């Protein structure tokens, strides 16, 4: 099954993602194919998939930016029916906004079926143009048609996945304890993590004994990423990944505070020094506490 | 002995505190007697006392606001010698800025002796006026003269004292772990703690599932108090007290994040809800983690 999470949904035939046009929250905003840049935040092209209780493999798809839902216009089963952004809720019974998402016949891409109409999300004519129509269309679960096949590029981790990434790190102290705060996290490209740091005012901040030392920098950076999350996105039900760690050196006679993020493949953590914006695989401390 | 810490230094005879005039960092700024308001931050009247290694009962006294040191002008032993703010360092060998501070004959107030001159800090003529001269003056350790007696009203806690206050609270979970970040903390009046919250932008913030929920409010409030500390004070070697806690309810089926501060008498913690600015003795959770 598709897991709860945030996805960048990419056509199997051409490099077009599912895009809410101009990120608009207006009801009836067209959802279109659009080109994308890997290893960025594609602002209008992220979708939170919420599983529906007691309906197998069926989800709402909420645009992270607008907070509006993928909606099959009037639930029509006619081929060519508009797919738009529309106001809704995460656990709606409105079948216009319910989508059954299961693996295609290639076992890697998915098909997206409207629960009401039983028609499929279709990049019409496989058009690679920016702004190409996406429609509900006749189809089957088993056919090869790439117009109706979609790669669900997972952009989020669960708290379980974040925990596993920390646990396989070689710089964790014997006494380590972690404290999980949220359930599902958007993983930032380092380019975006760096931009939030650059815009926080921390690059200008001076180290001062106790009054603005390592713990102040690390907590400020976590607060800055929290503020950015709320200010940037209108959807709810996820957080932005940014951890704080406390660490102790090999000799056991110095301790530090710093941040951490996750690799592109979501498998490993990377340390971030908020005093200088550096990313490190070894920050010279073993972590004895984290909260994230 | 006087402990390392931040003090409001109050004359034993009249309600005048030791005040760095206008908080000025200029060398030779007069240090004067001035009236004060209890249960506020008296901005020009806080002094960080740093003990000198291997010199018994002897300290530098750094004005928290200016970052400049109490200085006996040219170290003169003449009665009436100016006491001023002057640039220095926490562990100076400059005897103009070194002060032996021991209990007076009443066993509650102190006398303040310049280490070089062996004269005493004196509120001249016991003048209660705002801006009254404070001078180095002839005296003895044992005499009753209230012009030369000073109550050292302790405004800070050690991390050991903060730990003891948490430990005697009745709302601590069996599994509690605390993580100490700094050594010596200025304890805020609730009026100041509230002002920092009011000026943080948190009063306007809306609760949102995961993306700005309890953990975001509590970490934002700690970051806001950290920023206020660095921006407000020029001295180094202390922090502002503001804790984050994670808690779990009696039933063990809900958890929350919130802040905490300390009572006036420094003996107990008080919980702070950053979602509504309320202070509580019981916030309906038992703390299983804190960092402060």
């Amino acid at each position: 099954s598709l897991r709860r999470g945030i996805y960048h949904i990419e056509n199997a035939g051409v490099p077009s993602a599912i895009d809410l046009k101009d990120g608009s929250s207006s009801d009836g905003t067209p959802i279109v194919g659009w080109q994308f840049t890997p290893d960025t935040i594609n602002w209008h092209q992220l979708w939170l998939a919420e599983p529906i209780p007691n309906v197998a493999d069926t989800f709402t798809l909420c645009n992270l930016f607008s907070g509006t839902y993928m909606d099959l216009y009037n639930g029509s089963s006619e081929a060519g029916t508009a797919v738009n952004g529309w106001q809704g809720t995460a656990f709606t019974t409105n079948p216009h906004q319910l989508w059954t998402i299961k693996k295609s016949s290639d076992g890697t891409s998915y098909k997206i079926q409207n629960y009401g109409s039983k028609t499929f999300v279709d990049l019409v004519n496989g058009d690679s143009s920016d702004g190409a129509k996406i429609a509900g269309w006749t189809g089957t679960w088993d056919e090869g048609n790439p117009h109706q096949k979609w790669y669900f590029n997972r952009m989020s981790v669960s708290s379980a996945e974040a925990q596993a990434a920390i646990a396989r790190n070689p710089h964790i102290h014997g006494t380590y304890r972690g404290y999980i705060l949220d359930g599902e996290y958007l993983v930032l490209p380092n380019a975006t993590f760096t931009q939030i740091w650059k815009d926080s005012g921390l690059p200008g901040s001076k180290w001062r004994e106790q009054i603005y030392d390592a713990d102040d920098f690390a907590i400020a950076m976590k607060a800055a990423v929290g503020k950015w999350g709320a200010d940037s996105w209108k959807a709810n039900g996820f957080a932005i990944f940014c951890g704080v760690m406390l660490g102790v050196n090999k000799a056991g006679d110095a301790a530090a505070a710093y941040n951490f993020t996750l690799t592109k493949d979501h498998a490993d953590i990377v340390f971030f020094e908020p005093q200088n914006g550096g990313y490190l695989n070894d920050i010279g401390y073993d972590s004895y506490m984290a909260f994230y | 002995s006087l402990r390392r810490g931040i003090y409001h230094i109050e004359n034993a005879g009249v309600p005048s505190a030791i005040d760095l005039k206008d908080g000025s960092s200029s060398d030779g700024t007069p240090i004067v007697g001035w009236q004060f308001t209890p249960d506020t931050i008296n901005w020009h009247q806080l002094w960080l006392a740093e003990p000198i290694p291997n010199v018994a009962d002897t300290f530098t006294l750094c004005n928290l606001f200016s970052g400049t040191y109490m200085d006996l002008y040219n170290g003169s032993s003449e009665a009436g010698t100016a006491v001023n703010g002057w640039q220095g360092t926490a562990f100076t060998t400059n005897p103009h800025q070194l002060w032996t501070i021991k209990k007076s004959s009443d066993g509650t107030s102190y006398k303040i002796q310049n280490y070089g001159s062996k004269t005493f800090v004196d509120l001249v003529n016991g003048d209660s006026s705002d801006g009254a001269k404070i001078a180095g003056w002839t005296g003895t350790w044992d005499e009753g003269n209230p012009h030369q007696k000073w109550y050292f009203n302790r405004m800070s806690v050690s991390s050991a004292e903060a730990q003891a206050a948490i430990a005697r609270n009745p709302h601590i979970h069996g599994t509690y772990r605390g993580y100490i970040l700094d050594g010596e903390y200025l304890v805020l009046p609730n009026a100041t703690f509230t002002q920092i919250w009011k000026d943080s932008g948190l009063p306007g913030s809306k609760w949102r599932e995961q993306i700005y929920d309890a953990d975001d409010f509590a970490i934002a409030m700690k970051a806001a108090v950290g920023k206020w500390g660095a921006d407000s004070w020029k001295a180094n070697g202390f922090a502002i007290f503001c804790g984050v806690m994670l808690g779990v309810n009696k039933a063990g089926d809900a958890a929350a994040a919130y802040n905490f501060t300390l009572t006036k008498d420094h003996a107990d913690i008080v919980f702070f809800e950053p979602q509504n600015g309320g202070y509580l003795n019981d916030i309906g959770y038992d703390s299983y983690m804190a960092f402060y």
Partner: peptide, 4 residues
Amino acid sequence: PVVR
């Protein structure tokens, strides 16, 4: 050690 203290977090510094």
